[PDB]
Structures are given as structure tokens and as C-alpha cells.
Amino acid sequence: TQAFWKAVTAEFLAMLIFVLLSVGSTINWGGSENPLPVDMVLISLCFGLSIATMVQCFGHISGGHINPAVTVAMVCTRKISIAKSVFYITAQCLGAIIGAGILYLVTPPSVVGGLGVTTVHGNLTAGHGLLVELIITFQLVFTIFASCDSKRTDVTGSVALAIGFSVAIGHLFAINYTGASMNPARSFGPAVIMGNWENHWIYWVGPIIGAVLAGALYEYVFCP
Amino acid sequence: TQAFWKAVTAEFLAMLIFVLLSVGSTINWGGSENPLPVDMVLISLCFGLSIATMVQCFGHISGGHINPAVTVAMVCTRKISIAKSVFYITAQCLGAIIGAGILYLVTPPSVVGGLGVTTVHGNLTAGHGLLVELIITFQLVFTIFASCDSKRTDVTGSVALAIGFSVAIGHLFAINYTGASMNPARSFGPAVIMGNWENHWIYWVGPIIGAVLAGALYEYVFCP
Amino acid sequence: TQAFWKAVTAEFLAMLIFVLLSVGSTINWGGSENPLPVDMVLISLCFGLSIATMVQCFGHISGGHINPAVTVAMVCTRKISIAKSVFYITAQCLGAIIGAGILYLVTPPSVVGGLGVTTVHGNLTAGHGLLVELIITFQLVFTIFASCDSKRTDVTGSVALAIGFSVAIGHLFAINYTGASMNPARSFGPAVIMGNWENHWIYWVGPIIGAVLAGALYEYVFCP
Amino acid sequence: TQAFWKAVTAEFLAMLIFVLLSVGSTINWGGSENPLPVDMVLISLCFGLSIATMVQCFGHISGGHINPAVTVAMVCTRKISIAKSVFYITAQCLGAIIGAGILYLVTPPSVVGGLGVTTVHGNLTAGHGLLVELIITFQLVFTIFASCDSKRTDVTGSVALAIGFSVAIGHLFAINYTGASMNPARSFGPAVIMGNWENHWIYWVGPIIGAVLAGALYEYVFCP
Hints:
4 copies of one chain form a homotetramer. Chain A has 224 residues and is an all-alpha fold. In chain A, α1 runs antiparallel to α2 and α4 (82-106) packs across α7. Chain A is 73% helix and 0% strand. The first copy, chain A, has a single domain, classed as Glycerol uptake facilitator protein (Up-down Bundle), CATH 1.20.1080. Chains in contact: A-B, A-D, B-C, C-D. The A-B interface holds A 35-41, 122, 124, 128, 131-132, 135, 139, 142-143, 146-147, 152-153, 155-158, 161-162, 165-166, 168-169, 172-177, 221-223 and B 6, 9-10, 17, 20-22, 24-25, 28-29, 31, 33-36, 38-39, 41-42, 45-46, 49-50, 52-53, 56-58, 60-61, 105-107, 155-161, 164. Chains A, B, C, D: The chain crosses the membrane at residues 7-27, 40-59, 86-106, 126-146, 155-175, 202-222.
């Protein structure tokens, strides 16, 4: 086992640094430096680069699922056992919370902006709201599967990069609609700290489903 | 055949996600977050990263033409048969429409900004307007051919990346002139939905011609 | 010979597209979309990505000097003969002019912003003004030499990328001081068209010297 | 020895160009082009790209520690001898100063904005202020160790890139809190020139500690 403990550990750590890092960026802009639509590129970028860094950091040591939906679609595709996975998601979930609170600790007088409150922002009926998240986790999910799976026409890019990029695109587009949570873990860490789960289930339902279909289509209908 | 069906399929899907993704970005900025010239980098970037993601996603499974002009220059260079190609463009064309409408469905109260209305914006006589598109599809077209063709001094970069980048540059520069459509498929999906084809032919004429010359110069005059 | 003609040709073409592409970006922002300090990232980025594209496009076919100072430091390092090089610089120089004018042709009513007027902007005595250009062409020059030279600890990045990045950094920083010309060719194409050579020599003197020392230090003092 | 002299030299040079380059960017924005929160992406980006360039430039010739904390965590991990390292940090430290002053020389009438005054900006008690720096140097430190160390599942990305990216993320997030110094050398060069060390020790204490733990965790608890 024990070798596994390191994996769960790396995983707990990767999440904490990411949320702390990412959310910190959304908040950071939440300052008095004339908040502009530029915040979007900046936020989007930070998340996109944080993950690439994280896969770079613990991607080999833990696999790099670092996402409820990703860790979930993994099990259904059948990779990380039903049992071992639950810890993954839990290490992630704490990592979400811990790295978030400590972040909260750093800038308590400007965090109000949310501290990473991924809550169906655009005022559109849950379905239409959840749909966006549905598709994105999918594309992200898909990218990871596509890029990382075994046996390919031999690609020349950084597996570590595209995912960041998928994230990249993910935010740029999804940010205003649903907040582009596209990761239960990251959304969850702030929800414990804000004390508000405005339709939190939406983040588990969409991303997980968006997680399953992409992982599936690749396995089934796309590559036997 | 059937193996082919997957290819047409991947292709239909790649386009839908891209337009939905890309256009969504142009619109998304179309909010009340002080619209600035920053929109440009953001838009430009989203498209540039979306494609890289898409080639990453279905680039191997379908080849990654995902563009009337690209799929067209391919046939003239002689790669995808006259017959098989027509479907490619059609899967793309629907994918343009479907992913666009559903996008329309998500943000119906702010889409007005266009929903991706790539229509010769800069008020300059069609020729001067179409010229820009002429050249860009070319450079994009060229990049793909240059980077992807067989036998090279062995490059060290991500084939998946440069194209995104070509896109990248493409928008940054072409956006205000003609809207930088540089892809019949993407332009077309919104045109069905807006109900306006302000000189739509310009997008088929330029990009296709810009498509043919780049693909040609590489084949003929540059690499026998 | 003739095989060479293609090289000079690719080279003429690469420059034209780059200036047209790059300058177009500086001007493009020169619109009525609330010009902001954001223009910098955008400009910087376009140039940085345009070159990477260009090396990607004609980097193998011509070598990818595409710069008076670069093509010059090459000869002193001794690579492209004294004779063959003069054409290189000339193909580049025309390419600068041709791609620039035609650009001028596209947006004649907003180009006034310069059309790429790389002229010692910051009001600082030529020496202090030329110094900045001195150092940058060097670092760029150096990057190309460092990255591309033969026999290395075997790098894992895109040779095509770093140069773009060197460009990237180059602009971000040098833009306001001297206009970050860092390339005689690109500066020259607009100078013929604006009809003003406000201390044009500064662009040939600095970049060339900045070109020679970097190419030298690598050859001499750094790698025997 | 002498071969070593080149290493110390490359190292002195890399730092100078980086600070000059990076700080120059923070200041450059310090102009009359409507300073916005966009400055952040721009700054963040310049540093992130400057380093990647620098590792690209002298990363092989000197190893690419180019950071007190990095050069320090290296010795504790045991790589560069106790003796040889002190020079490294010193070449870096001068390089910080020299490249900074000369920068100061270029734009003396607008530098006031700081000239790179990485001083615990956010008004939060040293501990909370130093903490941020603590963690970042770590993640950066970690990335370098993770990416560069020997024997790995064989990565497909640019070792030269991730570090830049770690920098990338680093700034985006840390900039407003502590100024995101995340490098004693870079912070130090301006401190000699501003004549103010507002809690300078914070930059040596945090980054060094953040430097040691990341380098450690990788060596110990993560990879025996």
C-alpha cells in the first residue's frame, strides 16, 4: 500500500496549491486596480497555467486526476478502483478546503469578492446553467483522455500543456455563465468556507456527467 | 467504410465544440464588464487555444482539417477524395450550426452582440475586405501544411500548438478588418442563425482561395 | 544555385507576412475600442506569435534568419557567405516594404497611428535610446544561437517557440523605450512608407551590434 | 576550474538581463497609457517568459539555478558544493544590481514607480505577508526539481517552459500580496538602488524556506 499513500498525498497537495493559487487569482484582481473584462484573461490564464504546473508537479506521482469528475470518469473507464478512488476525491476535497481557507487567511479584507464562489452566475435556469458545465468538463475530460491514453499517432506536444489549455479555453468561455467551476473539488473548497451552496449539486451533476460521456465516447464509440 | 463514419463524426463534433466555444468567447465578453480592446486578446486567444485543443482532441481521429478551406485545399493537394471530402465540409457545416444554436440557447439575452457574426466589419470595399481573409487562411493553411507534411528537418514543437498560434496571430490582426472568419464553417454556423449573409460569399471565396495558394505553393514551388 | 532562389524567396515572403501581420496588430489596436496599456500585451504577443509561426512556416526552407541583424550576426559567426547574405537582407528588406504598403492599402483611414513607426519613442538621447535595442537584439540573437546551434544537452522545447518568446519578452519590455524594433527589416519597411527616418540608423546600429556580440559571446567565450 | 568561471559568468549575465528585462516591464507599464489591472497579466507574463528565455539562454551552461533560494535548495539537496554555490548567489546578486541600475539609467524620469520594489505590499503582518512568498518559491522550486530531476515517466514538454509558467502563475497570483518577489536576487538588485529594504529579510527568509521544503519533499517523502 504505502506507495499509494504518497499518491493520495501528492493529490491532496496538488489540489490545495491549485485552488489557493487559482482562487487567489480571481480574488487578487478583486482589488482597486480598475477591475476590467481583462480579469477574464487573467483568471482564465492563471487556472490554465496552474494546472499545467500541477500536472507537471504531481502528474506522474499521482496520475493527475485532481478532479472529482476526472477521478470519477477514470473509475468508470475502469482505471482507479472503486475503493482507491474514493480517497482520491477525498484528498482532493480537503485539499480544496485547506488551501482555500488558508488563502482566506491571507487576504481577509478583500476576499468578499467570493474566495472562488463558483455558483451558477448567469441567471439561467439550472438546466441551461448546468449544461455549460456539462460540456466543458467533457472537453477537458476528453482532452486528458485523448492526449494521455496509450497508443497514439505519436504526438509532439506537452501532455502537461493541453490540459492547462483545455482549462484555458474552459474559463475564457465558461466563466460568466456558470463560473466555469469545471471541477467539483475546486468549487467545493470555497463552498465550505462561504457557507453557501447555491445549487452546489449543479457542480457535481454537470461535471460528473460531462466527465462520464467524454471518457466514454473515447473508450466506446471512438477508440475500441 | 464505417471506420470513416467515426472520422466524419469526430469532425462534426470538433466543429460544434469549437464554434460554441469560440463564439461563446466573443459574446461572453459582450457583457457589462467594461468592454475594452482587451476583448481582442481574449477572443483571439480563445480561438487559438480552442483549435489546438480540438486538433488535440480529434486531430488524429479525423486528420484535423476542420475547415472548408482547409478541407478544400486538402483535396486539391490531393489527400481526401473529391467524394469523401464533401461530407467532411458538411459535417463541419452542421457542427457549425448546431453548436452555435445551442450556444444561442444558453445566453439568449446578451447574444445580440452577434453570436459570431463574421461579416466584413471594416468598411472597405469587398476586395480590400476579402483580401485580408485571403492571406490569413493562407498563412494558417500554410502553417498546417508546413508543420504537418511528411519528411522535415525534424521539428521539436507541438504540431497541435502552431496551428492554434496561427489562429492566434490570425485573430489578433484580422479581427477588426473582416472579423477574421478564416474558416467558412465557423462563419456559416452563425449566418444560418442570424439570418444575415452580409457578403457571406466573401468568406467562402477568400478563405478558399487563400486556402488553395498556400497549399499549392508548399506542394509546387516550395517542396517537390 | 536555384535551390537557393527558393530560400531567398521563402525569406522575402516570411518578412512580408510578418510585418503585415505584426504592424497590422499595432495599428489594428489603433482603433476606437478604448486604447489601453493592454495594447502592449496584444502587440507584443502578435509579434512573438507571428515569428514563431514564420519560423514554423519558412524556418527550415530558409534557415529563418529573417532579420538584418540576425542574418548579419550569422555571417560574422560565418554561416551564410558574404555574398549570399546580402540578398537575404535584401529579400527581407523588400518583404518589409511590400507587406507593409499593402497593409497600408487595407486600412488607409486609421493607419496614421504609424503603420509601424519604430522610432526612438521614449525621449532619451540616442545612446540611451539605442542601448535598449542594443541589448534586446542580443538576447533574441542569443536565444536563436543558443537554442538552434548544434550539439546541446538535448532540449525538450520548440525551437520555433523560444524565439517567438524572446520576441515576446522583447516587446513587452522594449516597446515604449525605442519601439522595440529589434529588427532592421521590420523597421525599414514602414520607414520607406512613412517617409520619415527619425534616427533610422539607430535601428541598424543597435540591432546589428546587439546582433554581433550575442552571436560572438556564444561562439567565443561561451562555446568553443 | 576555469570552465566553472564561464558558469558563474553565464549566471551573472542571466540574472542581469532578467531583472533589467522583468523590472523594466513593471516600470514600463508605469507610464501614461491608462494603468489598468491588465498590468498584472503583462508583468506576470514578462517575468514568466523572461526566465524561460534565460533557462533557454544559459540554462545548460550554468544549470539554471539563477535564484538564491533555488541555488540554496540545490546545495541542501546536495548538488552545487557549499563553496561553489556562494559565488553563484553572488554572481546572481551583482547581476541583479548591475542590470537594474543600468535599467534605472534608461528611464530615470518614470522609474519612480519602483524600479522593481518587491516589498510586502499588501498590508498584512510579515508572517501572513511572508507566507505567500513561502509557498510560491516552493511551487516554483518544486516545479524545477520535479521537471528537471533525473529518471521520470518521460515527459513531453519543454523543461524550459514549465518554469517560466510556474513563474507565470507565481506572479498572476502573488503580485499584489508581497510583490511576488519569489527570488532574492531579483528583489535585492532594486533594494540596493532604491535604498530601502522594507523588510527585505522577508524575501530571503520566505523564498529560502519555501525553497528548502519543496526541494526536500521531492527528495525525501516523494522520491527516494
